Ligand binder design. Sequence first.
Ligand code: CLA
Ligand code: CLA
Ligand code: CLA
Ligand code: CLA
Ligand SMILES: CCCCCCCCCCCCCCCC(=O)OC[C@H](CO[C@@H]1O[C@H](CS(=O)(=O)O)[C@@H](O)[C@H](O)[C@H]1O)OC(=O)CCCCCCCCCCCCCCC
Ligand SMILES: CCCCCCCCCCCCCCCC(=O)OC[C@H](COP(=O)(O)OC[C@@H](O)CO)OC(=O)CCCCCCCCCCCCCCC
Ligand SMILES: CC1=C(/C=C/C(C)=C/C=C\C(C)=C\C=C\C=C(C)\C=C\C=C(C)\C=C\C2=C(C)CCCC2(C)C)C(C)(C)CCC1
Lengths: 122, 56
Amino acid sequence: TLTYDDIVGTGLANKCPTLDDTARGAYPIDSSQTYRIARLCLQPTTFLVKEEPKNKRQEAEFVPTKLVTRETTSLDQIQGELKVNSDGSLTFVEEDGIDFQPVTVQMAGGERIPLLFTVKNL
Amino acid sequence: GLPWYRVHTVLINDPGRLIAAHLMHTALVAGWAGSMALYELATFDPSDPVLNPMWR
Ligand code: CLA
Ligand code: CLA
Ligand code: CLA
Ligand code: CLA
Ligand SMILES: CCCCCCCCCCCCCCCC(=O)OC[C@H](CO[C@@H]1O[C@H](CS(=O)(=O)O)[C@@H](O)[C@H](O)[C@H]1O)OC(=O)CCCCCCCCCCCCCCC
Ligand SMILES: CCCCCCCCCCCCCCCC(=O)OC[C@H](COP(=O)(O)OC[C@@H](O)CO)OC(=O)CCCCCCCCCCCCCCC
Ligand SMILES: CC1=C(/C=C/C(C)=C/C=C\C(C)=C\C=C\C=C(C)\C=C\C=C(C)\C=C\C2=C(C)CCCC2(C)C)C(C)(C)CCC1
């Protein structure tokens, strides 16, 4: 079990926890039971930005960008209600957490695209 | 003395200074290439190869 001193400055603190390959199981939902997500984490690996169409007005594509704001990008410690609906579908209702990060990515040619990467009120 | 349009003939019998002069010329031309490239890169919009290519 890793401590802060094991993690600090490695980059691991910006990584979400992973599960190994044997984890292909199933988690039963009791439709009489109330549920929560205790921690939702989102670690972005690629940011794509839609190029502004030349004027040809064809399909503008999403192009790769380079992250310049370093490993400051993940959303984590997010928690909320997991409702069980009458049709047996599940709905996550985000309540709180570190559910946003400012991010600047840089396009081919130098253009920097700041964004608020977020799942606020998901 | 030498007329102005003859100033460079001093190199005719000075192979070392002629080599030096050729080096300087070459330096100027390569410096030009570098600076031209830099200026063009400072002005070129690469955003539209279709209707705004370099030759436009
Ligand atoms: C490889 C190319 C080359 C070379 C090495 C030479 C070499 C030389 N020529 Mg020139 N010459 C050339 C091409 C060349 N010539 C061409 C193409 C022409 C036709 C226009 C002439 C016409 C010519 C004449 C009529 C004479 C020479 C003479 C001279 C000699 C003295 C140069 C001098 O003192 O100028 C000194 C020059 C200045 C102090 C200022 C010149 C300013 C110019 C006119 C304007 C600005 C030029 C700009 C900086 C250059 C840009 C580069 C260009 C290629 C785009 C020298 C041996 C003279 C000579 O034989 O002496 C006995 C001489 O009488 N040449
Ligand atoms: C390839 C270019 C070149 C080369 C290798 C030479 C080589 C040489 N020149 Mg020549 N010269 C040149 C171009 C060149 N010259 C030009 C274009 C002129 C006309 C201005 C002259 C005029 C000249 C004279 C009158 C004499 C020589 C002589 C000599 C020799 C001694 C150096 C000296 O006195 O510099 C003098 C030359 C300069 C200082 C060049 C002028 C500099 C110009 C204005 C450009 C400077 C760059 C600047 C930072 C950019 C401005 C940007 C602008 C947009 C504001 C030497 C062999 C001498 C010699 O030995 O005669 C017997 C001599 O007396 N040169
Ligand atoms: C080993 C055989 C050899 C070689 C490989 C060269 C090569 C060349 N000669 Mg030289 N030359 C030679 C024998 C040789 N020469 C002999 C026997 C004579 C009679 C004395 C001359 C007289 C001569 C004259 C009069 C002139 C040349 C020039 C040139 C150059 C024109 C191309 C250029 O500038 O590209 C651009 C340059 C590069 C892309 C960089 C090349 C990297 C260099 C070679 C490394 C420098 C370090 C090296 C250890 C020291 C110099 C090497 C020397 C053998 C050339 C070029 C470097 C001209 C020149 O020097 O003008 C500038 C010129 O004016 N040569
Ligand atoms: C293969 C292509 C080539 C060739 C053959 C030359 C040849 C030569 N260069 Mg050039 N040069 C070249 C490419 C070339 N260059 C490039 C790509 C650059 C980078 C832009 C330069 C930059 C350069 C500089 C900075 C200088 C030279 C000079 C010279 C000359 C040195 C010998 C001399 O004493 O002439 C004596 C001069 C002449 C015989 C007159 C040449 C007249 C030319 C061909 C047209 C002049 C146009 C007009 C009258 C004046 C310019 C307009 C003005 C509004 C600026 C020589 C004629 C040097 C020189 O001219 O010293 C005087 C010099 O200063 N060259
Ligand atoms: C708008 C303007 C602003 C631009 C200013 C930028 C440059 C400022 C410097 C200009 C002043 C030069 C003073 C002269 C020095 C001198 O002693 O001359 C004599 C020297 C040798 O030293 C000498 O040699 C002499 C004999 S001999 O020449 O060796 O035969 C002898 O008298 C003496 O003892 C000895 O010291 O040799 C020369 O003849 C060179 C003089 C020519 C210099 C002008 C060229 C400037 C353009 C260069 C641009 C580079 C382009 C980029 C390419 C890579
Ligand atoms: C990019 C870097 C730029 C820096 C380079 C700077 C460029 C320098 C350019 C030098 C050119 C100077 C011109 C020399 C002018 C000058 O000195 O000539 C007089 C000169 C006489 O020289 P001599 O052989 O008699 O020797 C005297 C010596 O002292 C010369 O130094 O003859 C030549 O130079 C040939 C060119 C004749 C040119 C004659 C044309 C002029 C007649 C009138 C034209 C206008 C009126 C027309 C009416 C329709
Ligand atoms: C030294 C040292 C350093 C530095 C260098 C530099 C700083 C750079 C450069 C170069 C340069 C940056 C300079 C130059 C060039 C320019 C030129 C040479 C141009 C030309 C002009 C002319 C010649 C043309 C004329 C024209 C007119 C003007 C108009 C129209 C007509 C005509 C076209 C004629 C280094 C680090 C490298 C290292 C080594 C050593």
